[PDB]
Amino acid sequence: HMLFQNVSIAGLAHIDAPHTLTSKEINERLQPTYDRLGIKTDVLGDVAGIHARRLWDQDVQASDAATQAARKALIDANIGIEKIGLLINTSVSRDYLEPSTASIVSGNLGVSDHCMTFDVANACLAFINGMDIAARMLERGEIDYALVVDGETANLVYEKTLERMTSPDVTEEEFRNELAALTLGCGAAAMVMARSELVPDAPRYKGGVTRSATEWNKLCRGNLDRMVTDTRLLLIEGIKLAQKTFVAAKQVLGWAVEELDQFVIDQVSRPHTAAFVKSFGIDPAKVMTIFGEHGNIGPASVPIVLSKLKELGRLKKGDRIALLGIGSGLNCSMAEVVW
Amino acid sequence: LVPRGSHMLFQNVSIAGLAHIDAPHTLTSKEINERLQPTYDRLGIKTDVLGDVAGIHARRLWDQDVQASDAATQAARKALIDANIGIEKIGLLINTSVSRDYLEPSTASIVSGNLGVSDHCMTFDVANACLAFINGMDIAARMLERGEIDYALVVDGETANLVYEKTLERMTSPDVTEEEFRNELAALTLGCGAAAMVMARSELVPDAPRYKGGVTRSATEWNKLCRGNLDRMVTDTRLLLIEGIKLAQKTFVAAKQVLGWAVEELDQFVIDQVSRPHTAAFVKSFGIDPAKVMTIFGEHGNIGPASVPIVLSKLKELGRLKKGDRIALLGIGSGLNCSMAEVVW
């Protein structure tokens, strides 16, 4: 019924992580163990379509990556940190349980005594939830500008996950559920959202809709050291939920597929992406992809893709952009930006 | 006379149900002290820092196999009964606990699935030290005000079992430095427990309490004062106190301008449940009647962000609260962040 009319996107930025680890290099150190279980296939590069991913320097924490991203977004919006009234950290990666990663980022930045901080956690949907929570405060006049940040680190998942599978003992089927950890990638993004009367020419966030199917809360379960995931069923119920969520998006957003100029989606693998496009009859040309060379950056994936699109001059004034994702839960969220 | 703003305060947001869960197993400060006595002796500690100094005589613990999500869910069920509604009415569920099942999925997902929420139910977590429940209250308040939903659940289950056994193991080490002992000591004032609140648009529950919200100030340059993972918390209790009070004080100046507050015009203060010195310093700093500040750290310790709602729920359970009571919710979380909000009962 009632969309956001005065929430804009004032600045946007990403950080690509500096070290590359190729699925080839990974596959070499995994060959012994592939040859034990008699698996012929290259599940990373052939099936998933993931050929490289980036990793941070030694002991770069999430809050560091979020800080670098947040600094660039601030420069991109051409405002100083004294203007930020809210800072939401959305990452899966978290420096500690207590306190929030947001507070660490905000301290690194020197936010004012008026800036509210906290973390949102919700798998690959968290950035969109963060964006929506910020938009609610902006519209109410609680704040004029917000930072939504997200830094992801998988350095430790790789050290530990590899060693576990390349031991002498090794398991059998855990391998297939564990390999999903070797699709993960490091990266960061940040976005400065703002009240529109401040930034009249800037893109606008209208909000959107969420639907869920939390009955499947078992299927993807990540610690710091480990990610266990059934990808096959997550794919199907994911798409079933996405469909349902698109019906909701018709009703509140006034959406159809032919009308939308970009689909910015969570980045998992070639099969998640292809199934999605096929099910919804989407022009593949409107669907930018980064898992090929960066792997899965969880909730940073969406704003990384939007920022990349922006920087390549793909986004014309007036474009209608679908932000969407299918996160563990299962949850699904879909929202609109009008460039 | 002169038309005023709302001061950004929440309109037509109500509390339709409230519930807490006490964890089953009692752990006394005597038990703890008996176990730590060889270390106390080695370090020359001749006072009961838990019982006499910190004011905590006991705390509660779950079984070791019990999860945040399980406690969050028990509480959620009791709050639904309290609100006399089914789970089909819930359009938003935020888990606000520090304790978490996994890094993903959200602990709210796991609670939501156990309860059987509809496919219209929005779920995510909010983490912000002991201030998160209030943050979740605000996030849900904004949706209910706008009329995007009818009912919200804010849920919070804490478990400290693991930090308890590992901290006790490290603090009884023959090699443990005084520095490390003191750093880790606050973890032995933590406690298990859980809480849940159903909130609603006032139109649906015309006699329920009103949640007005309030003000927030921060001091993010102190983010390293208290830091915790699954099995360990390190705490500069001295600087938490001093910088916590300064921040409280600053927020209270803002509470006067937006809430029209004054300590003498509030009937209850629901605070973070930390310790007897933290509590005394806060009461003395603002000139508050101690009787208007209910305390449970004595027997349950510090239940992080569950403490506020647990105290609220217990205040209701005892019949302290009457229609019209002006109820200050004030939280100083690790960060530092301080929110001060008002519930009118």
Swiss-Prot record, chain A:
- Catalyses which reaction? a 1,2-saturated acyl-CoA + an acyl-CoA + H2O = an (R)-2-alkyl-3-oxoalkanoate + 2 CoA + H(+)
Report keywords, A-Z.
Acyltransferase, Cytoplasm, Manganese, Metal-binding, Transferase
Does the UniProt entry include the keyword Ribosomal protein? no
Q: What does this protein do?
A: Involved in olefin biosynthesis. Catalyzes a non-decarboxylative head-to-head Claisen condensation of two acyl-CoA molecules, generating an (R)-2-alkyl-3-oxoalkanoate. Is active with fatty acyl-CoA substrates that ranged from C(8) to C(16) in length, and is the most active with palmitoyl-CoA and myristoyl-CoA.
Organism taxonomic ancestry: Bacteria, Pseudomonadati, Pseudomonadota, Gammaproteobacteria, Lysobacterales
**Location of the active site:** 98, 124
Protein source organism: Xanthomonas campestris pv. campestris (strain ATCC 33913 / DSM 3586 / NCPPB 528 / LMG 568 / P 25)
In UniProt terms, what is the effect of altering residue 124 to A/S? Strong decrease in activity. Displays measurable CoA release only after incubation for 24 hours
Q: Which residues bear the site annotation Important for activity?
A: 266
Q: What is this protein called?
A: Acyl-CoA:acyl-CoA alkyltransferase
EC number(s) from the headed UniProt entry: 2.3.3.20
Which Gene Ontology molecular function entries are recorded, alphabetically?
A: 3-oxoacyl-[acyl-carrier-protein] synthase activity; metal ion binding
What does the comment on domains in this protein's record state?
Contains three extended channels that together form a T-shaped, three-channel nexus. Contains an active site base originating from the second monomer of the dimer.
Quaternary state and interactors: Homodimer. Weakly associates with the OleBCD complex.
Where is it located? Answer: Cytoplasm
- Activity regulation, free text: Inhibited by cerulenin.
The source's domain of life comes to: Bacteria
Where, in this chain's numbering, is Mn(2+) bound?
Answer: 19, 57
Gene Ontology biological process terms in this record? fatty acid biosynthetic process; secondary metabolite biosynthetic process
Instruction: Give the encoding gene's name.
Output: oleA
